Paper text:
The Chip/LIM-domain binding protein (LDB)–single-stranded DNA-binding protein (SSDP) (ChiLS) complex controls numerous cell-fate decisions in animal cells, by mediating transcription of developmental control genes via remote enhancers. Chip/LDB and SSDP both contain N-terminal dimerization domains that constitute the bulk of their structured cores. We recently discovered that Chip/LDB and SSDP form a stable complex called ChiLS (Chip/LDB-SSDP), which binds to NPFxD motifs within the nuclear Wnt signaling factor Pygopus (Pygo) and Osa/ARID1A, a chromatin-binding subunit of the BAF transcriptional coactivator complex. Here, we report the crystal structures of the DD of SSDP and XLdb1, in the latter case with the help of DARPin (designed ankyrin repeat proteins) chaperones that mask a hydrophobic surface patch of the DD required for its SSDP binding.
Numbering used by the authors:
A (entry chain F), D (entry chain F): 38 to 194
B (entry chain A), C (entry chain A): 30 to 197
The structure:
């Protein structure tokens, strides 16, 4: 509750020492704000790898979805955070998880334009054929946002 | 009044620095867009087809990208927009919208992307954007007069300053 | 909210055409300024002293003059203004104000005059400007990149395009 | 009243034929709006010389002052209307009339920068020494607004 908030704040600001004080003072690691963002969502968006690892280790839900159906793996993939994408898949993050729009992580990485992040998702069995609300595939999104390397790859599966 | 909302939007964008984190773009998108918002950009018909259509989860990532270019300044200028009212929502059709960005520290180029912007807004307390469609006609780039004084006598440097740094 | 008032002011200026009569400038000044308003402009300290101080009867004539230059477009951009409240009035101190004008049909130059704008507003229903002080730091002129492409190979025409068309 | 308004409108839009229909239908030529503008103020600002002449002829007050103390001669001088300045002086307009700010016609012409208008006012006995609310003289205003021809002249009286 009270501690709930401080731990979202600290997870956001990548404040490693302050995440430990709170977790030791009993902060809920599956605490959520009005959006349905968890520490994991926040740390995964701002690229805070060490906080991702330690939250996952203390039972943070790898597959927690916000009110828009968005998971940390969606966010890591969209914002182009390689190491966090790898750590989340290993903690069991759903590679073909669907938000309210029908976006998968692959869709979001196809957009962001991170070459390796796409291959890691494809290696972990991302659906090359997944259609968002607008009938667009990761392929399509990579043409749209002008990532022609990524689209070569996506033309293979 | 819808026009206040795009003033408030330009005002928020002023607070952006290289020092701002990716979650600033989410809080920004929460203030001005609905959870199910849609955003379409139709690019200059001098190029090929080119047409973003993206939902809410990608909107933070769209706006961020405008400043990945070197843009350190973004505002939308709406000349003579049409407000219309309906059952659930208000439309704002602006045939003379200019998206203005300024590149560089110091400023070395201004980019004006002119087109029609159509908005639908929720008619509630929050007045957030349901729909965003910007169909671009053209883009022009302006450079300081000073840069031209500087490189008067450099055919090669004038040949490079001639070239657009963006596509639209 | 004072910031809405300078949005409304930029919005009114959009309705100006060569086709508008001198009394349009009076109706404009009545909407945004008090009957006893005061307007000060302090010009670039690279030149001499230069300092307008004018009362209400001359304010219509001041604004008109901005468009006698060839300017067909005028708006004020306020980056991070300070609203303060007092007994009779509200102050708005904006250290990062840009006065933007665009010259020509078609546009061939944009003029940015950057300085501090201090406003006092009546705190009543009308929220009109009691006081207007703009102390200018600098002005820069931007030209289309296209104009430079055009005259790449014309030393003489590039020498003329080098020169400011305004003073501040 | 009703007719009062139509005659301000017509005086503004320089609509010569519509000023005659109204004057013939009994319109008050000293009719005034919320500002205290008369047809004469309006026609003198928009440069409508013929309407100025015909209003003056049917008893329009040459020296009518709006709520800010502003007369048609102030307005003609400020907006740079030579023929209207001449017609108003001949109908007896006060050449040294003071508004709320302490502006005279000469102050306003010193600003506008109309070389002849200044000399006509000076010929008609304009005060070269008149000080506005800010202690500024027509001279000063012509330096301020960068009219160095006008200031040469004003340095003489």
């Amino acid at each position: 509750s009270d501690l709930g908030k401080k731990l979202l704040e600290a997870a956001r600001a990548g404040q490693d020492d302050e995440v430990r004080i709170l977790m030791a003072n009993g902060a809920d690691v599956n605490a959520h704000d009005k959006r349905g963002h968890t520490p994991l969502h926040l740390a995964a968006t701002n690229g805070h790898l060490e906080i991702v690892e330690v939250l996952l280790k203390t039972g943070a839900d790898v597959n927690a979805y916000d009110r828009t159906g968005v998971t940390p793996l969606h966010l890591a993939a969209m914002w182009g955070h390689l190491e966090i994408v790898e750590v989340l898949l290993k903690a069991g993050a759903d590679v073909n998880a669907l938000d309210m729009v029908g976006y998968t992580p692959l869709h979001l990485a196809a957009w962001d334009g991170h070459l390796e992040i796409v291959e890691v998702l494809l290696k972990h069995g991302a659906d090359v054929n997944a259609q968002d609300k607008f009938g667009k595939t990761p392929f399509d999104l990579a043409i749209d946002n002008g990532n022609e390397d990524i689209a070569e790859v996506l033309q293979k599966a | 009044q819808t026009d206040y909302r795009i003033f408030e939007l330009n005002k928020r964008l002023q607070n952006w620095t290289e020092e701002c984190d990716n979650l600033w773009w989410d809080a920004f998108t929460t203030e001005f867009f609905e959870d199910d918002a849609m955003l379409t950009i139709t690019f200059c018909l001098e190029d090929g087809p080119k047409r973003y259509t993206i939902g809410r989860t990608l909107i933070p990532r769209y706006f961020r990208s405008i400043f990945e270019g070197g843009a350190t300044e973004l505002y939308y200028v709406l000349k003579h927009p049409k407000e219309s009212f309906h059952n659930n929502f208000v439309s704002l059709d602006c045939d003379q919208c200019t998206m203005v960005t300024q590149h560089g520290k110091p400023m070395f180029t201004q980019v004006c992307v002119e087109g029609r912007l159509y908005l639908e807004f929720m008619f509630d307390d929050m007045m957030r954007i349901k729909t965003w469609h910007f169909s671009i006609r053209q883009h022009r780039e302006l450079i300081p007069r000073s840069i031209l004084a500087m490189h008067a006598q450099d055919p090669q440097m004038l040949d490079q300053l001639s070239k657009n740094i963006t596509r639209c």
